[PDB]
Design a protein around this ligand. Structure first.
Ligand SMILES: *[C@@H]1O[C@H](CO)[C@@H](O[C@@H]2O[C@H](CO)[C@@H](O[C@@H]3O[C@H](CO)[C@@H](O)[C@H](O)[C@@H]3O)[C@H](O)[C@H]2NC(C)=O)[C@H](O)[C@H]1NC(C)=O
Ligand SMILES: *[C@@H]1O[C@H](CO)[C@@H](O[C@@H]2O[C@H](CO)[C@@H](O[C@@H]3O[C@H](CO)[C@@H](O)[C@H](O)[C@@H]3O)[C@H](O)[C@H]2NC(C)=O)[C@H](O)[C@H]1NC(C)=O
Ligand SMILES: *[C@@H]1O[C@H](CO)[C@@H](O)[C@H](O)[C@H]1NC(C)=O
Lengths: 6, 658, 9
């Protein structure tokens, strides 16, 4: 749920 | 009046309930493909963090037309899904499904879950951007996608969302055309807001490799049939006007439509391969306008209907394509006394009139004569005004002649609680189908009509009709009544399954659907004898030209009312055209011509007629006087067209020329 | 409430 990518 | 023996037993064992445990939020349904029976149900629920209850994003799948569902949320790794982007379903039976995820604040880009196999398997993909729009499939290639970023960049994927390339950095609007052609507008300074009417319309054919400017000073653009429309702004002025292209922007032409101001709008009401219905907003806060019909070039327009209801800034309009009969459209007009009347055209807007009222119906208090009036139809406008209207009019092209709508019988649209009316001949004659507001669905190309009573209290009964609305039988589909929300059924009106959605009476409510398979109600397949010959548009049976609409007749093979059988999924509407000989009434007046029955040359070119004459292509200025109605297929008879004139010198003869 | 799935110029 609501991932973070960079 | 209801010849279905023992229908209860034929339905009881075909009623399939599915309670949706752990559902508390909004619900979206999507059908994935035809004849697949695949339905996706999406929910998204946001909860304050100071509440012990957590959020929720569930995803259910069916493959039996909604009879049973499976919680496949595990396939999207239980991720929050953006409600606004919903479910992006691929074209036709590509089985393409794309869901957009909510990503945490600060991410490099967004991410999507993609499926190319009817939502059996999903894959993650981190995007190089954050989506602003729902991803759009190319009609010619479901593997081709485009989207706008939150930075107003245009991104294109050739591999179904796998890899993305940005092909323009300042885009306002982008659309797919034929053969994977992308049309998009762009801005130079500031934003789409600031460059209102100062946009540039671009086109790419090779998916971003190369471009071509095909319009400047652009307000907006649209696609309809073979027509590309663009509204262009004037110079040292804030008016704009329609230009149109049929070669994808390579060559343009100013339409013979009036220009409009800032507070005015154009609306492409409907467009096919032959022509377009164009609505022009009236100057002022009137809430009405004028309908124009175009020739087959989208260039010459004839006034079709005055005071057409269409609210400010292009809000609600009642304009309805009656899709179950060629040439029929209904809409609302605004009278002088600010009442609303419904009008119907049977010949693609060539002539409008009032809808004939049912033989047995008495007239409203809106009707000044108690014995004489007409039928008026509730549609998008009535619904917006919070009238008790649960559904707009319904018609399906495979159910020939059938039209269903909430209406009222009088001199104007009534604010009273509406009954439901049906026509079987495409709008010519009507009958009260059911008393009181209902939801309705057509199954099996007219073989079955289903109806649910609109109530403020929970219902547990469905109504069906195997004779196109004349006779009805009620079936109690559940022991415990539900608060009805909607009817779902496979697009195309060919299935024999219908789903009744709603929530239980409550201790919190739970979503529930009851799907009914009418396969044992229509236990017999239809045979040749079950069909009759029916001439469409028949008004005068003995007349040699009876049923001639836009040059020709069509005789159908319709299912008999009495014949209780299944048309089948593969059912083909059988019809035979008879080509009528041309009369003058198959021809519209060309530019610079009018008829006070023959088209005669205009003495006064004024208004936008004069604007066209002074700024248009000489090609359109050289008229025959007559031009054949678009879609008209009459052969032989009369032919009043040639090349006689060149109207350029006519209008310029008044001006002094350098 | 559920969600079962004219151009302006
Ligand atoms: C009002 O609704 C009617 C019915 O939906 C529209 O007529 C339909 O128009 C489509 C597109 O032109 C026709 O489909 C086409 O069929 C041919 C095969 O003949 C196919 O090659 C094309 O690719 C396309 O799929 C459809 O047959 C036709 N229905 C009829 C004639 O009963 C009509 O266009 C709508 N009005 C406006 C102004 O759009
Ligand atoms: C109403 O819903 C039911 C599902 O509950 C639909 O049943 C489906 O019917 C199709 C058509 O017969 C079946 O496909 C067929 O599969 C066989 C393989 O055994 C194949 O050889 C055929 O060519 C055809 O593709 C499908 O399996 C079946 N699904 C289920 C779950 O039974 C029914 O079609 C719906 N009714 C209507 C009128 O659409
Ligand atoms: C879900 O998470 C697993 C493990 O982190 C990962 O392998 C997979 O690619 C993710 N997405 C899907 C659709 O399973």
């Amino acid at each position: 749920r609501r991932p973070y990518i960079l | 009046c209801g010849r279905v023996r023992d229908f209860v037993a034929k339905l009881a064992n075909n009623t399939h309930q599915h309670v949706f445990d752990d559902l508390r939020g909004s619900v979206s349904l999507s059908w994935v493909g035809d004849s697949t029976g695949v339905i996706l149900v999406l929910t998204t629920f946001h909860v304050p963090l100071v509440i012990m209850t957590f959020g929720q994003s569930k995803l259910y799948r069916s493959e039996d037309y909604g009879k049973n569902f499976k919680d496949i949320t595990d396939l999207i790794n239980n991720t929050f899904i953006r409600t606004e982007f919903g479910m992006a379903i691929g074209p036709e039976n590509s089985g393409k499904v794309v869901l957009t995820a909510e990503v945490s604040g600060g991410s490099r880009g967004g991410r999507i879950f993609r499926s190319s196999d009817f939502a059996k398997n999903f894959v993650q993909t981190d995007l190089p951007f954050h989506p602003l729009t729902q991803m759009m499939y190319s009609p010619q290639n479901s593997d081709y996608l485009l989207a706008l970023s939150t930075e107003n960049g245009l991104w294109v994927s050739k591999n179904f969302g796998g890899k993305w390339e940005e092909i323009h950095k300042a885009v306002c609007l982008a659309k797919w055309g034929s053969d994977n052609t992308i049309f998009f507008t762009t801005y130079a300074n500031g934003s789409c807001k600031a460059d209102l009417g100062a946009l540039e319309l671009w086109r790419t054919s090779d998916l971003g490799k190369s471009f071509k400017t095909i319009g400047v000073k652009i307000y907006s653009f649209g696609l309809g049939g073979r027509f590309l429309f663009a509204s262009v702004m004037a110079d040292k002025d804030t008016t704009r006007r329609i230009h149109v292209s049929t070669d994808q922007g390579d060559t343009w032409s100013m339409a013979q439509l009036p220009s409009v101001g800032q507070e005015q709008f154009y609306s492409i009401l409907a467009a096919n391969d032959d022509m377009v219905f164009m609505h022009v907003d009236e100057p002022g806060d009137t809430g009405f306008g004028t309908i124009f019909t175009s020739d087959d070039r989208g260039i010459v327009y004839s006034k079709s209907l005055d005071r057409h209801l269409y609210t400010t800034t292009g809000g609600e309009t009642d304009f309805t394509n009656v899709t179950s009969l060629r040439g029929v459209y209904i809409t609302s007009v605004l009278s002088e006394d600010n009442s609303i009347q419904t009008m119907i055209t049977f010949d693609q807007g060539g002539r409008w009139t009032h809808l004939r009222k049912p033989e047995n119906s008495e007239c409203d208090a809106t009707a000044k004569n108690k014995n004489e009036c007409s039928l008026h139809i509730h549609a998008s406008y009535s619904i917006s005004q919070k009238l008790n209207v649960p559904m707009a009019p319904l018609s399906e092209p495979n159910a020939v002649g059938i039209v269903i709508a909430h209406g009222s019988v009088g001199d104007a649209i009534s604010v009273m609680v509406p009954d439901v009316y049906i026509s079987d001949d495409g709008g010519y004659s009507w009958t009260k189908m059911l008393e009181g507001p209902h939801y309705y669905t057509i199954l099996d190309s007219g073989g079955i009509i289903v109806a649910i009573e609109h109530s403020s209290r929970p219902i547990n009964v469905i109504k069906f009709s195997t004779d196109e609305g004349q006779c009805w039988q009620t079936y109690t589909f559940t022991r415990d009544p539900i608060y009805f929300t909607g009817l779902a059924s496979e697009p195309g009106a060919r299935s024999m399954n219908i789903s009744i959605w709603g929530f239980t009476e409550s201790l919190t409510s739970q979503w529930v659907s009851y799907t009914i398979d009418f396969k044992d109600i229509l236990e017999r397949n239809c045979e040749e004898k079950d069909y009759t010959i029916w001439l469409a548009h028949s008004t005068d049976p003995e007349d040699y030209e009876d049923g001639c609409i836009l040059g020709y007749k069509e005789q159908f093979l319709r299912l008999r009312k009495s014949s209780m059988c299944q048309n089948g999924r593969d059912y083909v509407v059988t019809k035979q055209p008879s080509i009528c000989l041309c009369s003058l009434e198959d021809f519209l007046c060309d530019f610079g011509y009018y008829r006070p029955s023959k088209c005669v040359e205009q003495p006064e070119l004024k208004g936008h007629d004069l604007e066209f004459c002074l700024y248009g292509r000489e090609e359109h200025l050289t008229t025959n006087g007559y031009r054949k109605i678009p879609g008209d297929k009459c052969q032989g008879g009369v032919n009043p067209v040639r090349e006689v004139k060149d109207l350029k010198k006519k209008c310029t003869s008044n001006f002094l020329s350098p």
